[PDB]
Amino acid sequence: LKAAQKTLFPLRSIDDVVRLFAAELGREEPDLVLLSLVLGFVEHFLAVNRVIPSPAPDPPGGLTYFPVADLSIIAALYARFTAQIRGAVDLSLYPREGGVSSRELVKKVSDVIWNSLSRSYFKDRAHIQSLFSFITGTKLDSSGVAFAVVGACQALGLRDVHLALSEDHAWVVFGPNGEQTAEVTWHGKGNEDRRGQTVNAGVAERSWLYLKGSYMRCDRKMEVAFMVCAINPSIDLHTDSLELLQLQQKLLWLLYDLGHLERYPMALGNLADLEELEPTPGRPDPLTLYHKGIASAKTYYRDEHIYPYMYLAGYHCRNRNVREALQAWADTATVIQDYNYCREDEEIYKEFFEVANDVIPNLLKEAASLLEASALQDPECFAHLLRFYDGICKWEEGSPTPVLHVGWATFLVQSLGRFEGQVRQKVRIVSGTVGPVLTFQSEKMKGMKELLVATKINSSAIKLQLTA
How many separate domains does the chain show? Predict the structure, then answer.
C-alpha cells in the first residue's frame, strides 16, 4: 500500500469510506482489492455479524453503528491476497506480448482463484460477494469469482483484463480493444462448466443471458461501481442495514458524479431505488434516474436490456400509477420479443412470470376494486396489456424452451376480464406479418386478434391458443 492510501485510515464512519473511494477513484487505476476488502469488512460486521418506561431500557428510535476498519487489519488481508496470487502465478512463464494478456494467462489466474474456493458451500448464500469473503471465508458467489479474477489480474498488473456483465452473469474481457472474451465462473443450479471458453456461442444463440452481445465491458472505475452495487445490506429476511443502504447511496452518487454510471443502467436503477427510500436533498428525483437508466440502454446497448424498464414499471406500480406501469412492462415485452428463451435464462422468466401472474393481476385487482364505488376504462392501459403478452408470445417463437402454459392462461383471462368490452373494443388491432392502433408480431396473438375484443371472453379457447 502507498502513503496516500494509508493516511485515510482508520475508517470510523461511512464518509471515511467515501473519502477512500473518492481518493481511490481519482487515480488512473483504482485499487479494486483494497476497495472490495474494505466493503467486505464493513458489510460482514454490519450484516453477517450484527452486534445489536422512561428512560426506555433500549434506544427507542433504534441504533446504527460503524465497525472501525483499522489499517493494521485491512493491509493484513491486502498482503494475504497479493501474496497468495503473486505466489501461484509466475508471469515469466506467459510471454506478456506488449500490454496484452494470453488466454493461457487468464485461464491460469482464473484457476488459481477457482481452486482456492472451498470444496463445499451453498452458492446462493448472501454476503460472499466481497474479496473479504474470498480471503477470510474462502467462498465467493458466481459473479464474485469474476470480480476476484479481475482483482487478482490487477495485482499482477494485467491492465487489459476487465469485468464483463450482462443482466444475470459475469465473465472477463482481455486483449487489444477488450475484444477477447473468457468464461471464468458458473451459472444457475448446477450447469456451467463453460469456464475457459469464448462467449461467441451465447451471443449468437440470442440468449437474454449474453444480451445478443450488448453487455457491459468495464474500465477499472466501472469495476468499482459494480463492487458498490454488489454491497448487500440484508441482515435477515425482515430487516436491512440502514448503514449499508446509506453507504451504497453515497458511493453510487460519487460514481454518478464522476460519470462512471453513464454505461451502467442497473447501477442507475439501484440508485433511483435508494433515492425512493431516502431522498438526498439536491439530487435528481427517482423517475429522472429511472429514465437516465433507459437512456443508457437505448444509447450504449441497442435497447437490448430488460431491467431498465422493470426498474421503472416497479416505481409506478408501487406509486399505483397503473398506465405508466403497464406501459413500462409493455416496453419490457417489446425488448425480450427479439430474444430467445434458453437453458440459463431461468432468472428473467421468473420475473416476467411474476408480473404476468402476480403483480399485474393484483394492480388490476386493486384497480378494479377502486372502480366499485379508471385505468380499466382507459383503452390505452388495455393496449399496454396486449403489447405485453404479444412481446412474450414472440420471445417464445423460435426459442428452444416453451414459455406459456396453463398457469399463464388463467391469469391472462383474469387480466383481460378487468376491462369492459366497450373499452377493449376501441383498441384497433392490425396484424402486420410483413382510439389506440396496435400491431402484433406474435402468431399466438394474431391467432386471437378478434377474440381479445369480443364482448364475451371465450376464456376456454384463449387458454387453448395461448399454449401450443
Answer: 1
